[PDB]
Ligand binder design. Structure first.
Ligand SMILES: *[B@@](*)([O])C1=[C][C]=C(C(F)(F)F)S1
Ligand SMILES: *[B@](*)([O])C1=[C][C]=C(C(F)(F)F)S1
Ligand SMILES: [Mg+2]
Lengths: 277, 277
């Protein structure tokens, strides 16, 4: 049971309980207003407690996707947009400046609400802010944040792909090709996005999907199985050997490895022309 | 320039090179058709080569969000939709059944095109498929895939959070609360996605966002800095101490820790009510 304010680019959802002057709670890391609901109950007889799901979280919905620069660590799009959400939320519920509390990164949003929309602010509270920009040692703390985020975003992935490599016995050539960075940064950032997506939304769902041997036998005359000449011993060739074992469907060898169609396009094509040309 | 076919919930983009019978190439992990163009160049005098950007990748775009259950590892929404795209693409490019080659996860899409839309297949080729469902050792390979993806998705995040709370001296009760797993498999998936979004899209961007001490001093009578009585020594209280030392803006102690509003709501309210009630 949530309220909705439609705004530029999002349906902003929020709880509202009580009577009197409006009191907006801005969540921190958890991003959602439910975490203030026991606090609201203790306040609903003095303030109209409004507790927001910030537009990227919870029951709030984006109506158009984030800009691609939002992943840049010095992008200001999201913090400024959250702060404008709170100001428009205030302006839609009150004709007076309102009370505001933010906690942790939510208190940083609160700082930007006061900076950019001081006319909506009656009183404001910053509960344990982690912003570092104005500290004498801002650099130390910014560098810690950057390096721990970098570790999280990269280490486990690198290890897991190598573990995939040994477990599946991927050929060296494929391994280097399949894990080579892009010459640009716009192409390099996309490639982490894409790999993360394949991992969460493709590999498990597709490799355990609803194909039976019976499906191949039904139309056996149509099917060729292809094994690369440079990827012998790898797990997908064993998939083809098993299909062939149980169905009789022929295996054709074709040049290159798992990526043979671009490792060796000429020889790849010569085989496809022999089969189908 | 690429070609476009508009389907339910997606605009599907694809390269088209050559003439002759239609030959559809379905990409695996990289998900885009460009990887087939050097091959397409070798076949263009024999086939109308069609190299697809599957709908979640490349120059294709969704026109509706993925279903929330698509992150479920047992989901078959994506593989079915991909298979249905290829069938629709074939039907839009030929009145005769066509030639189709899929590679790796793209060969799995090709298998579902055959199962569910055999009417569009003249011949089909499965290049190095990694599907395990029908293998006699299926449990082995399914559980390897599940474990390695899970490790990739969770391991470095669990380590980095632990490093974060220790660099920042987050209170034990707070670290306990902010890492506690959700109580459902579906709750944990969203918890993971939420934390992963916060790390990539919020922590660096907000904590180094453009706020200066003069932004506070300009409205000093409006502000209260709040420190939890149970999170002493933690980095955010250090931030508040600095703001206070430089601007004289008051620090008020409020019960609980970084999550005090939920940890002790009664005592948290009593302070707020002292402040603004
Ligand atoms: B409250 O959610 C936070 C306390 C420290 C934070 C950072 F990691 F940004 F330093 S966030
Ligand atoms: B081709 O891109 C693949 C070879 C092995 C794969 C899996 F990780 F699923 F086993 S995918
Ligand atoms: Mg604005």
């Amino acid at each position: 049971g949530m309220e909705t304010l439609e705004l530029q680019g999002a349906k902003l959802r929020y709880h509202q309980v009580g009577q009197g002057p409006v009191l907006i709670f801005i969540p921190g890391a958890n991003g959602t207003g439910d975490i203030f609901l026991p606090l609201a109950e203790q306040l609903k007889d003095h303030f109209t407690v409004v507790a927001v799901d910030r537009r990227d979280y919870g029951e709030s919905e984006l109506t158009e996707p984030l800009p691609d620069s939002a992943s840049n660590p010095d992008s200001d799009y999201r913090v400024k947009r959250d702060a404008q959400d709170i100001a428009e939320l205030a302006k839609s519920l009150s004709d007076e400046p309102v009370y505001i509390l933010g906690s942790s990164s939510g208190s940083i949003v609160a700082m930007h609400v006061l900076k950019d929309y001081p006319e909506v602010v009656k009183k404001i509270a910053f509960h344990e802010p982690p912003i570092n920009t104005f500290l004498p040692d801002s650099t130390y703390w910014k560098d810690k944040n950057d390096d721990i985020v970098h570790q999280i975003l990269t280490e486990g992935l690198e290890k897991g792909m190598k573990t995939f490599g040994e477990t599946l016995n991927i050929a060296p050539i494929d391994a280097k090709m399949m894990s080579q960075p892009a010459d640009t940064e716009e192409g390099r950032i996309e490639q982490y996005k894409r790999t993360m997506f394949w991992l969460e939304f493709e590999i498990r769902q597709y490799t355990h999907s609803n194909i039976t041997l019976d499906d191949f036998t039904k139309y056996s005359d149509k099917i060729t199985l292809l094994n690369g000449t440079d990827s012998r011993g790898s797990f997908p060739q064993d998939v083809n050997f098993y299909i062939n074992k149980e169905t009789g469907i022929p295996i054709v060898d074709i040049p290159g490895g798992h990526l043979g169609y671009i490792q060796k396009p000429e020889g790849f094509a010569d085989v496809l022309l022999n089969m189908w040309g």
